[model samples]
Target chain A: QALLRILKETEFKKIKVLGSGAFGTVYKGLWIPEGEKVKIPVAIKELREATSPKANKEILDEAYVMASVDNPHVCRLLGICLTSTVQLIMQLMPFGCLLDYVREHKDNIGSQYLLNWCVQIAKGMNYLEDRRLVHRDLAARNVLVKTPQHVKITDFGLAKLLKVPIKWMALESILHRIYTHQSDVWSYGVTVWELMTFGSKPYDGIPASEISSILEKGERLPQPPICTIDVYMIMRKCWMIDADSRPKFRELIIEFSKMARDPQRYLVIQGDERMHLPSPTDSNFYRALMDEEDMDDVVDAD
Target chain B: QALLRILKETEFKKIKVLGSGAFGTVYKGLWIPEGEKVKIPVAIKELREATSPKANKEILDEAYVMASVDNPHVCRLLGICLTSTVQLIMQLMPFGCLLDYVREHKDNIGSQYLLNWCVQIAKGMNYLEDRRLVHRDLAARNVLVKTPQHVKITDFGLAKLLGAEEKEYHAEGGKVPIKWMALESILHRIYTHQSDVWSYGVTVWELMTFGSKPYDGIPASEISSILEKGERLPQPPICTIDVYMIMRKCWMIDADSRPKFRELIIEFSKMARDPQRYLVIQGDERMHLPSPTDSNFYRALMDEEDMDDVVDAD
Candidate 1:
């Protein structure tokens, strides 16, 4: 009943491996769909052998979720290829993930760009929330940036969808595996924090084990150096311990829309607060994150 | 003797013919260059067998010209393939030519998008001007649209190159895009970098009309006559008067008075960035405006010197 089309593997010409993780590897591919003269660019997510059967089932569920909705803010699932391992064909986002885009253009980007992305992310999340879809994981890495102003939320439903770090999960999700729209709102707070810091790790130098207790004690990620208290308040609201107390994606969209239109009024830097930020290339923590060759059992460890 | 890199013809696998023209056919091909593991997408322009030795020399010259310049807004020439006919390997632009793109997305695009492209085109032209290279052909059809906001100027060196002989310069003999030509280019067959500026004006007008052919009702044979009578393309309905004014400046009959690509870039960039200030349209006032007349057209006829001699001598 879902909008899913089964495509042949031969129809796709895999060009290059864009990214690889525990569950699967995404390739920059060219696809000649049935009865099409021109080859269009696509991202092909090929499931890995190492992925558990339970994870595979979750992936299949994710595919069903992917085929159900259509929005400009969400990554479009074009089709699927089922061989020994399944392949999910997706729309190509030329600029890659928001994490990489912001980090790459750290110096050139201003607060307005961040606000615009935040508004777009909220818009995407709001659509999903209305559809009764819980993202469970919404972070900088899970979002695709089409341009500086355009961002799309991707990799929803699947558990640890292509190796998202455990640090982004809500306290309820981390402790009891309970995922709701509220939990997504909690993760959205961390994603916005990542945007403000130009993709700094959510809890830098903090172990994954300490995350559950930290939220229990009511400590949150500090305001990003350049971020105004006005903007930081939005992030703080998303981090409220009582999941119901957290702002909905619709409310966040309204708040961010107001900020994006008049960025100067909301995003004002207070008194010599601008500090020198590290280049994206200089972040050893990020390098370490990429170096994790075997993260398939990360979720199971909990 | 040139920056042209000779690539193996065997390395390229032609997927589909993107477009074909008189001089050559362009194929969207997959190329595994020298040591690269993955096959990168490339547009391979294959010269037609109908081309003569004189035309072949011009194609070779164009290959050198394409290899020399490097800019973000200009189509990058990757390499060349030499068989019985020549092939130029270039960076692939997925959205195809600007004309097709504009025509396809007519209703969706706005002034900001148009202004952005105008700025990009001017930047590319400015870079070419600094390198002392003349893109004699600058039209909407010759530009490639990479994305909604990104465009790259292409088919420059090839246009004027193909029109080497007088027999190849006119309609029955050769099919040149006479609609985009300036008065000097049309009347005396004189083309300069400034003549390119004139074509740029027409290209902008073409963009404003959502890739509609310039001088919609007029024939190519009668274009020069109307131009001689000081008539120009009318302002597009959606185009702001401010933008039409800049386009008019590019069409200034005294080629010397026409704004350079650098000046155009600055003007377009400012307008694009601050759209609210410049891009304002009120009422049906466009209908009340007097028709444009090129005042300098008669004055410049006396002193117009031959700028095409040095360009065409090769």
Candidate 2:
């Protein structure tokens, strides 16, 4: 392929392919030793397989969204090679994702860490929302938590500008029918829940097909098991049924600042009291907590 | 004449023409007169003697800029009328300007008020810069102080999208000179964003002097007399030269060395200490204390609602 040929000419040796998605395949690559700092790490995204015309349209849509966006919190696009196949070179995130981190230290990661992560996520989300870009697929797996506590949001293949109608959303009758900035805010609520519960699966018992029906019937994921009451309230604001009811990124930042600066004041429920649940002993408390019907009822009330 | 004709058909009787500049004339107009609750008044800009080509281009440019920018602090362009001559209807401000306010209450308004006003100005400027629009002619006269502690920046007539060379600057001594126009405007070039910041510095000076002439006794060529010699005005401004030093960073000889509107806003906000913090006192001494040259400094400095209270003094 033209991309592979160009990489070969540039003396870049392909180490190993990491993952492949609808947009491109990620390959671990290295630069040859021409000078000092040789063997520098990079993530190469090679576009090979023919994407559906619909998917290709979405890919271009995501490119436009990424091109307009620039922030420290969002993933940086290093360079791109356009030839027989579109290849995007980006900053390699070695630490992987929040999901991996949560799985590794589910017990040690508490509400404080979750709240901190949520605030950083909100900052990135706010930057996107300000520019009228929406990250439709905002999950723990998508968020790349890096060194020095830097959280850079990646995986924009599913992202779209706020104005562009998601043809996919219209075909299905869903509670939040549109892929909007507010919908991303709703996704942030789920991400916050993931942070608090240490990578808990969203809507565990509810089937993916039923998600639309349940969401339409006013069912949303309850607050994470160990989340502080104020954080839960913030999540409630994010996951508001009416898209308009959800707060803008500016408002979210203010709320985060208030909670972050004085966590004790906003921590309505004490950690000791919150830890008194029947499945508190379970290593994967996130899974066990979602099984409780009472918790779901409380979230519904919110 | 064509603009007057369009204004005549409807409620032009109530509309008052404010000031006319090179681009357009701003008119104070009322909207929704017959409605239940009175709609807030608006400022309608009527471009003067513009041929269709020029008018169309200006309208399109403004529309493009407004459509792209969405910020709360910056003045919002409500709508546009393309009838006889292009009319841009914008949000109206009752409180005239920080310039007029500073002039009238030259003594009373402290660094606190100046700092808050400057910060608000920077915020509006930052929003504009983010959208890649530069208000080339930023002056106290251009900034409209809206009611209830809000500053609405108006007069985008000189505003142009970034990277567009609407006006060309001739370089002098390896530096483009717009900063020497005022002590703040000279060091930077005319087209760079830093020039606008330099204008902000002069604006701060205008506020401190209470709308007094910037170079009252000095000639244009003799800028060195006032700026270089540090010849103190009979009445010095509220903010000291230290504030001007911050402006100097904006007026750096190298355009690349200039601090952004974001950085300037943060620094100015810190210096301007709002009501929460003690007034920006230099070395525990009130900077705005009137010297023997200006006796009314104490009285003018004490007046609250300095905006409304001081206008008559000018």
Candidate 3:
């Protein structure tokens, strides 16, 4: 308990709850700092509140992974407050999960925007993969998109520091599928597809047990309806049946970076008029804070 | 005219209509034996009746394109019966379109099966591309799959023969952007080798989604929605982004720049089973058809060099 620890050092005037997850609830606190009014936002992850040892271990793992990764594209872990329980006070991203955006504008966004956002995530993933780490659960809900649609990969609750030498096979395999840098690439590929498809659930309708068999058999979902040949081709390469065949995060970053540089060169044409269309109605808060030029570049079509 | 031609022959008794398209109506037919009561199965394509001069020329163009293609992955043009109307006779494929199988068994089928099918189509398109022919109309309805999932590219109603002097920019106006048509097809009406690449992308979608509607929920009238809004059909719920990216590239707007069918075939093949090898026995024949076998005859078909050519090309 971060709350118990905080209670010992200082008393808060008021604590208002923000959101809750499997780990703990987040609260916004109003405190008197030297008799001056101030507001502090802290995510209070109640470790002792975990119902089982497995749940407790998962909470600890989240803290470990967040503490390990220090990058702009990742959620920064500020400091951990521990007592009988633990609370993680991390740098907060004002914007929420990417799933919100995808759900709202599923029909209008195309693969270019999807791939653009995916590149940002690939940068973060490359860092974690370099250390041979696996974010076992990577989904739209786990990625936080701050202002300008810049994404930071979050939610390390399922992250694991994979041990080297043991060959993990497929992500679906509980025992054999060796966790490696490559498996992360596989997951990243799925995540990118999710972004492009605007939050469509990965492997929709397929049972988890059958994923490895299906993947091993070289079965893939057809390219999303909006996916171009290039995008589809790249995805297929990432999802290669053999993990060895998948591209590394570094390679993926370079490739996607090159792709992002000249969307037109790749034959991804953004209609002239659409290239500078006004931002969506929901973009008001982002517009107020961000510079006009920066926002234009952020929303500009390829 | 096709009907009149079949009526005059008296040898074929029409059974029932199978399917119809803009060009013609296909009917199941039975061949009557002179001395025996046995009837042989056949398929007849009856060209539309009362064609104007323009329609006649279009029919001739279709015939020429279909006749020039001689690949196992394509429907075989047996012969044409010409009277007042024209009838194109083709080999009957009893199994029907590949979409039927994918639709019924989406759960069991995986992306690999779809990739394999796409690869086969690419191989066929490669062959046609090598001959400077373009099958403009490539859709789910145009592909016929037999047993063991061997695919044949059909429906040459819009096929075009590219001249040596022809450049990629040449175009025709107002073509149908079959929801499965790649991005290039939507932007440029001209059919080149790349058009098939676009169709290949759609085929991949068809295969993976088990014939889920292409561009589903996107209005057919929304050319501007695609152009101005920069919107594409949503990815299938289960698809990986890598796969989506590849498909998106195939739909690129620049027709000249689209990936070649040969390149697509190789890339898709690598993701498929036996990445280092060809799935279909690559040779003169691109598909493996099941047939009744006589052991001695089958043995004759497997000479050492022939076996080497068939199995060792990869």
Candidate 4:
């Protein structure tokens, strides 16, 4: 009954389905609160889990994680629905996910803008850690871009429950099914590589079945041509063989903030690069990632 | 099989449904022609007609009309699909319709811009009538805006049936767009190129009023008497006397006396080139009903039934 404080199902009117994942389907919808004349655009997630007391408690548990946290870099939970289907209403980030934002703007995007986003994501993850939450699925796809200068962390606690983001997993998490805040740090290192290379696939041409063995052999992602030595050094530190040796979110925040302050000092420029980027509408990479059917067989047998 | 000039059903990959109506559903889709690496964004209309031979012939007849005409001011037919369901592929107009555009940008849209759009619509209509086609349902909602300066006319022969027309013409089965019809059309079911000019007059009123419903506060049942009385929509606040004069000429009681679309195109272009010389606004004599009362007056003007259902192909 406490969920009534969240929202009623009647409050949301679904416009269309944006995507369908293992746990839920996301919809572009409109929300009108009681006594309000205006309708606010929102992203609604309708949970697909079984309907039982256990399922109800599990849905509320994830909602509490989203509600307790408050930060400009984090997506906020406006309300939840209990009847019909369990739906969580979230803020709509119109610019879409960061991975596609980077790829579509590859030719024109400067180093300063990319580094600024890195600093923003670091602050968001730091806030999540402060609330004792581990974002095991930390990748460029999981981060949403609101504008060129702003980004927010989304799909946090819920991603770990299904454990489907295989390519982004740390060595220990992939081999032994062990996940911790350090595992998220390892994933963040991969995310920074994604931004530096303008959304290039990690381990391009490498099979998912060989990722764990390759990590065991101590191979790290190679440097992107546009990435400077300073940015590459941060990624190396985050991927240390011993999880204890990985830099904490607090330390990473300080380091990224310093680099973002004077981006020219740490970033290299290629010739004839432009500044204004078109909206990311034509790209099909987002749809490519949405289909997780191929990853099911690659899950680790621990 | 010349209709194979269109595309096959397999060529399109549906992204999501944009809307659904009586005659069909519209989807935001990707179309990749044979051997092309790039996918073009398109609006696909999966037509909802019967599968009988006569129904198929009627569908192809409509397709032929769309294919035979080609103009920058008209929405182009990209291709068609004949399997599973009959679908018409059209160019995607990203900015949506002119009526919504005017309503959304009421404050900043200047007189010069509105006049330019009038010229564009007139030229499109002139082209259509030259091809011996009469646009029975012409309105602001039927025009798609590509930019502030560019727009294309859509939903041309298809409005005779389905959806938004279902509401405006709502007689269960015998409804017509009474408010948009000319004097002869309302009195009798007859329509002609001149009658289309009459509807174009009301569409211009819609733009001037920033997309206000035509004949506001007057019921559909009373429109005939209102037109018979020689009383028509008044000049809106931002409308100049010259533009309002064009609207009066189109509302001529005898359809034959109305100016041709070519004359309208000439008049609109002349004024547009010298906008500053004629940018005069009308005053308190803007409407017949002087001072409307009640807080619901603003809300009452925007009823759900007041929506213009566009029968656009895009």
| CA RMSD per model (angstroms) | 17.4, 26.9, 30.1, 15.9
User: Model 4: runs farther than 4 Å from truth?
Assistant: A1-5, A34-37, A50-53, A160-163, A271-273, A276-302, B1-314
Task: State the displacement of the C-alpha of residue A47, model 2, in Å, after optimal TM-score superposition.
Answer: 4.7
Ignoring the other chain, what TM-score does chain B have in each prediction?
A: 0.81, 0.66, 0.72, 0.78
Q: Kindly indicate the candidate among 1 and 2 with the higher lDDT.
A: 1
Query: What local lDDT score does residue A117 receive in model 3, on the 0 to 100 scale?
Result: 74
Worst 10 residues of 1 chain B by lDDT: B305-314
Q: Rank the candidates by lDDT, best first.
A: 1, 4, 3, 2
Candidate 2 lDDT over B139-217, as tens digits, reads 7777776432446577653444222222323332111123234344332334556656656666666665567665564
What is the model-wide C-alpha lDDT for candidate 1? 0.69
Best first by DockQ, ranked: 1, 4, 2, 3
lDDT of 2 at B231: 49
- Candidate 2 Cα errors over 4 Å, as ranges: A1-11, A20-24, A33-37, A47-50, A53-68, A157-177, A264-302, B1-314
What is candidate 2's DockQ? 0.01
TM-score of each: 0.51, 0.39, 0.40, 0.45
The all-Cα superposition gives candidate 1 an RMSD in Å to the true structure of 17.4
Give per-residue CA lDDT, model 2, range A74-180, as digits (tens). Answer: 76454445455666665566556777777776644433344456667777788877776767777777787543134668765443221222211211314435677
Expressed as tens digits, the lDDT of each residue in A1-302 for candidate 4 is 22223666776699988776666888989766433333556788887765333566777777766655667677655466777667877766666788878887777676667777887788888888888899778889888875455677887776543326677888888888788888889999999999998999999889888998888788989988876788898898788879999988888877777776666666675742443222222111121111101110111111
Model 2, residue A65: C-alpha shift (Å): 5.6
Q: Rank the candidates by TM-score, best first.
A: 1, 4, 3, 2
